[PDB]
Amino acid sequence: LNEILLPEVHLNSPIVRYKLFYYILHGQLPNDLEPDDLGPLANQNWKAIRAEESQVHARLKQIRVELIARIPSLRWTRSQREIAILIWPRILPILQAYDLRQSMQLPTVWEKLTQSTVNLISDGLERVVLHISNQLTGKPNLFTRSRAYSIPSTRELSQIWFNNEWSGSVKTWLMIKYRMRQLITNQKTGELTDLVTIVDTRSTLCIITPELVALYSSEHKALTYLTFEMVLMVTDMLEGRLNVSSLCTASHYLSPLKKRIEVLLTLVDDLALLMGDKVYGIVSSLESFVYAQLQYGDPVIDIKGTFYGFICNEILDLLTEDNIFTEEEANKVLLDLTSQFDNLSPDLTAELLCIMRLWGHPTLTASQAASKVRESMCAPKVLDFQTIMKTLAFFHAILINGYRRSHNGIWPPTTLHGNAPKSLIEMRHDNSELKYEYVLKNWKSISMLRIHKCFDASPDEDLSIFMKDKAISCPRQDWMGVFRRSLIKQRYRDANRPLPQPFNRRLLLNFLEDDRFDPIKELEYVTSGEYLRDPEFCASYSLKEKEIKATGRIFAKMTKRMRSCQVIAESLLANHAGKLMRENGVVLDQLKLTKSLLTMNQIGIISEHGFEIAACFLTTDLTKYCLNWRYQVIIPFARTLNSMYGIPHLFEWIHLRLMRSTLYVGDPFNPPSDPTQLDLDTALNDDIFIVSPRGGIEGLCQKLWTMISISTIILSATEANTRVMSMVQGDNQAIAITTRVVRSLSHSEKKEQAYKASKLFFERLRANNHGIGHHLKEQETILSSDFFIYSKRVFYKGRILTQALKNVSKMCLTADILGDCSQASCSNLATTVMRLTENGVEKDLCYFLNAFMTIRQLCYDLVFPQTKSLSQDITNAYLNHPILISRLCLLPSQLGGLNFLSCSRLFNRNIGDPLVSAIADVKRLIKAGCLDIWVLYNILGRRPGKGKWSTLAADPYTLNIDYLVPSTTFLKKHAQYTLMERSVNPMLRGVFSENAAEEEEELAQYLLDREVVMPRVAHVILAQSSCGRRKQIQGYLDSTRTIIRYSLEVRPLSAKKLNTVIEYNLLYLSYNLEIIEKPNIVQPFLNAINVDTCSIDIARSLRKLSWATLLNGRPIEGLETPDPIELVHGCLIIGSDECEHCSSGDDKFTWFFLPKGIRLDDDPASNPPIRVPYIGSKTDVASMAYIKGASVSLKSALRLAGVYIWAFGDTEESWQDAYELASTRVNLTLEQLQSLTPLPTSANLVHRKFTPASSYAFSSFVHISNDCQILTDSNLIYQQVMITGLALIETWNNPPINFSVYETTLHLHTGSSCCIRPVESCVVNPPLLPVPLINVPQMNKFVYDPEPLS
């Protein structure tokens, strides 16, 4: 079992300094740590601790003896030796010295294998790119226009990835990680033997144990000790450094950065050696300095350089707090740091946000983390009643205006106070919109108005909230169960008290294991007041991983009941109250979200083609407000929300409970310093304790806080008489100040006037936020006439800057998910490559990089085997033949390969049918020379796999070919099944069924064993049926590592399964060996399929042949969709050129036009007018009647019923087959269902954080026209064509290009092409089977509704 539940591949846990201190003091390892460094560990009776953990001391004593033997000078005390013992932040400028180059052969074999495999396809990849360029533009320089310099092929990419700096370091640390993880697995399994590894490289002595590694460099005479977490940290950082440096070397766009980045690293590295754990503060300043540099280029004089100067003064302060550098030295260092940020384009400057995670993370101590939240909380804070009432008055105004615009233009139930004037009474009576201009005046009546119950919210409205795992803290007693037993054992021995019971329970498991669970009774914890009298309540923080700033370094956990109440409250706020305000433009749909963001950023970009409109953007960071929220500033909002929801007291909970509990930071290796304080109530506000925190916690009650901030923003806008469009989200808000200027005015003067208008609103907003008690400093607020910040991406002059290096920094050589299959890792690499395409990096470079890194991963998995196999025949057959590696890596995933990135994916995010795109890509590779046609013939002639009727319907577009399902997904499914079969919750009573799988099979046979097989409709109907609802509920389970571990523990996997999970990668390689080795004898008619045959036809034939056993020759209809690249035969017209297609017969095309004179980052008047580009079109019915308030169970039934009729038939037998299926989830009669069913015509059949599809630099000036085209599959096809044309125009003028000296036209002819075909459907189909006996959960509310209609 231990061969699945492996140690983590990457960093997912915080770095604990005291863990390393524990492991080095436990073995008496040499060190120069001062007594104050050890903290609480210095007073521990280490002799007793060494008496226990006998195996760990044996290992640590052994490594100490070996350090003494190899280097005698370590015996010397008083630091009289020349060897220097250093900790993580101080080993930064030496990590290149550690080489281990000799006595290590696996990295060398890996590099040689990757080189040999890449050398066999680079020429073919280049030809593929050239053919794509010729068939999408008609000219061969589509991808090479911006760079023509050097055109890096896949061979060049591999060379520069393996010959760059940090390459040897990355190989060394990969070997160290591999050895250490082998050691951890061996120690778990209990071998007890040979668990020390001694490479003993010349000038680099490294000793590895399952607990720690000692690394000594003779050149610098420096020795360091690293724990496993810090080893993962170092290897991840170094892989990120390699990736960033390589990409900068390769991409001409990110070339000017390269040298600068390197310089920066060196400086900070040296600074680290001087500073230590504090150098990350400098790093956390740099993440702000980038924005300052952008603010250095704004037209307004009064707002130019303010942020730059202030951040420089903060960096000086940081460099001079410990007096490491004098003022002159600090000024130089600051100048060196800044000189790397100057003389760069705006997006290159924004591209410098990658380096935050290039220096690792700070070593975290519980006391230091607790100090920040102790200063933020538990602090006196003044608040202004007026500011609070005014914001409550505007809150009530927005809530009234939100109930309206909804609820049929009528006011919510409201009672008017005795002051309300005659005007407010009239407004209530006539149900009229409350004008913010009115609300600003009379606030003494807009507030003090109770919005009585308006919503019928139920705690059981959403089930997905209850079945997501959240960390739960132990009871107030047994709160030291988190700490290591060794440290607190002695303290309790001198206290004559029993040892604490360790806590491991999880919230999801506890819900699932409750015989009686009623959310109406769960909320009675809060409503009745029990939360204040509960003595077992305990909330504790725990150090947060992957954080470099002091704030946000800890996240909190609470008890089960208080976490359940919190999640219920958050769901209640999100479902009903949060929908009522839209003053903020943040939305759940990403498409409209980025549309609103682009319009906000392009408010002020008006061209020449009177009064004009001007915009000044203000972005404020909201990280530290959570700790600044007090009870006084949320009580009236909480009191009106409670009225609106009908509950007496649900909100207001976070603060009320926190005033009366002592919080603490929970780290197993960070016990309290005082061994006499062993109860939580008596604790003092020092060490790791935070006594009576008066503020809120991150995430908790965030909806109310965002709601109040929106109210304050609207208040400040109305006070200053200025129109704004806020974009408030959690932790960052952006406001686009709008003003009216003279059109004829100069651009600099226009923005000056905009800033002068924005000054009053900024002052009012500062005063308002200070009134509610959250002081705004220069750090948080950033004012620009050009850009704002949202979701860590900047919006600069109608564009979203690239920040591709940040994406490439997190591209490593394995995925953390338990399975650790090669498919998963290659999919992760492909996803990062798609992010790189979307982030401005050359698409040719992205495609070559994807091929190279898929090759790199498999080779790494082959040469670094995770699990030892008795037979190495498969791995030897793959290692000794790089041609097999290349063929398998270039093969598309849908066909059994690991190439998860398609050629069409380079341009459009939406794909449609993945197997048509895969066939296109394989054709391309075949015609170029990468793959051979016999591979395609083998794939066509491949023997059908082990597929069932449920497997075609659950996941359409998928072949009956084994091992396309990664082990990971299997592990998630097994965990979900184990937990639901164990679930006893009243809500999950009827959800689990022992006959679920065979019911799925029978229903899938009913929908699919027909005259025509239509897998899309089968998927929709299954997902809309009772069994599909049960599958969705079972899929709501989190399936987290810990959950997977639990599931494998309480429900042990059987032996064969155990083996098939353990050896999934080897079985997958063996299965693919049949198609990528030699030309297999196939059936003859397959000679008909050629590389010139349209993908769609090959996809139809492949689906017909792969599912031959299931379907017996019947064809599959409703899946095929043309590949976006093969459908369009584009042509780019420059100057005196003319379109060949148009001029030769063809007449269907999508016209794109980019004007002349567009100079970005310049005067908006000169360039042509800007507009929001086409970012896509999401779902956008006229049923015979519109039932409002329809339950989830009813809308589902009407869509199933409908698609059955639009698809299988319009008869009465067809109808007796939709009424029964809907009856599994509804109680409607035949007449009501029939009439309430939406129109069964043109069924869309659609079914199943902030990532922009492009920078929208030159796509905002483009003109689109489909007037010469026909135009819900066709709609998707034409949307894909438009997106492809947009991507082509964007890649024609890559981010290096900032000008257009000529006007370009794209025709993108889609007619005259093989892929387009007529669509015929809705033919009558009998069921060819009796209706299966569908077991329905009649009692269960979330599956069936006894009363769907009033």
Binding site: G418, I635, L656
Partner: protein, 69 residues
Amino acid sequence: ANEIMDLLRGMDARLQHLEQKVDKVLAQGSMVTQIKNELSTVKTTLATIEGMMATVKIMDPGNPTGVPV
């Protein structure tokens, strides 16, 4: 005789005096008009003050606040 008509003469004149007196009596009423109109404000400001003080007591962190209904 003639005296009587005179008596009536005075009778009427005096009656005419009541009128005069009554007049001032009446006018006084206007003062009222204003008092009622103003009292209106007195009530508006008073209530606002009442809400303010009431809210502050509600704000007290120490005592939990229940909202009727």
